[PDB]
């Protein structure tokens with residue numbers, strides 16, 4: 001994929017309408033959301049979708065009742081917006097208590113247990129007494145555990161649809177919901193001789209510790225540019241997360257712009273910056289979507305998303321590289337770290353013309369310079 005291709009929103013047909021989708025946006029051709037779309041039906045007047053994606057799972061409700069959609073992914077939010085579907089940039093747990101009759105929730109299993117449980121409690125709290133919840137999942141990805149946990153929270157609940165390993169359950173709130181568990185976490189770490197206290201919400205990458213790959217990148221960057229090498233320089237951190245790379249670079253004096261697609265991660269970065277008396281731009285953005293057309297940088301760094309145990313570079317990761325090459329000023333430098341299995345070398349060679357390997361250990365740190 002090219003740049004325009006990655007950022008393009010494409011409308012796909014369905015009976016009675018169209019729905020916009022794009023690379024990097026979850027929700028389409030997803031068995032769980034698909035089963036939901038075949039199962040959900042109206043109940044009451046106010047519905048809430050706590051894991052919208054492109055909005056296919058709860059689409060049957062559109063036009064038949066009021067539907068609120070709390071979306072955390074910017075890529076997905078762009079699609080919902082283009083589709084004309086009511087949606088808010090919001091975390092699942094920001095949902096108003098007891099203000100809904102129906103909640104639709106495709107289990108966000110990929111985000112981890114904490115995120116899932118926060119979403120389950122948010123659903124229980126969002127519903128009025130007697131409210132209904134459609135919970136969908138994969139038996140191979142925790143459905144049974146979470147369904148049982150949802151029953152414990154609400155009371156009544158039974159499976160109402162099955163397809164292969166995919167399931168949809170319907171539950172009713174018969175008991176008062178518990179308060180929201182504390183969701184903020186914080187941990188201290190020493191990076192390149194300095195101390196930092198990172199703060200993060202559920203679902204962030206590498207929760208509770210600085211990822212070894214991120215550390216490797218920073219060590220390689222300092223070795224190549226020096227401890228003052230980024231002072232006063234404009235830096236773009238692709239997929240900033242809670243700031244493993246962002247905070248140290250800001251502390252080193254760089255003018256950093258972090259772009260992150262996940263809202264929970266964006267808020268984590270913002271709290272971290274504040275807590276460490278550091279300043280940087282923490283943008284909620286689908287890759288470089290939030291930037292001006294003219295924005296350019298002196299240094300770009302990234303620890304791109306990846307599939308555990310996979311050997312294929314993800315669409316978003318490829319876009320990170322393409323954007324890096326396009327956003328760097330001539331003479332500017334790009335640092336990328338990844339597991340040994342990913343074939344980034346030919347990609348960098350193609351996009352930059354040449355590249356270098358700065359480190360080869362548990363992870364490999366690749367480097368490239370922008371040619372004018």
Ligand SMILES: C[S@@+](CC[C@H](N)C(=O)[O-])C[C@H]1O[C@@H](n2cnc3c(N)ncnc32)[C@H](O)[C@@H]1O
Pocket residue numbers: 024075205206211214238239240241242243244245259260261262265285286287303304305306316
């Ligand atoms: C492997 S993590 C690393 C995060 C952080 N830089 C670190 O080193 O700990 C990759 C980051 O890319 C973010 N991401 C995924 N898709 C994205 C997208 N389309 N645009 C921007 N960021 C994205 C993920 O949410 C995650 O925060």
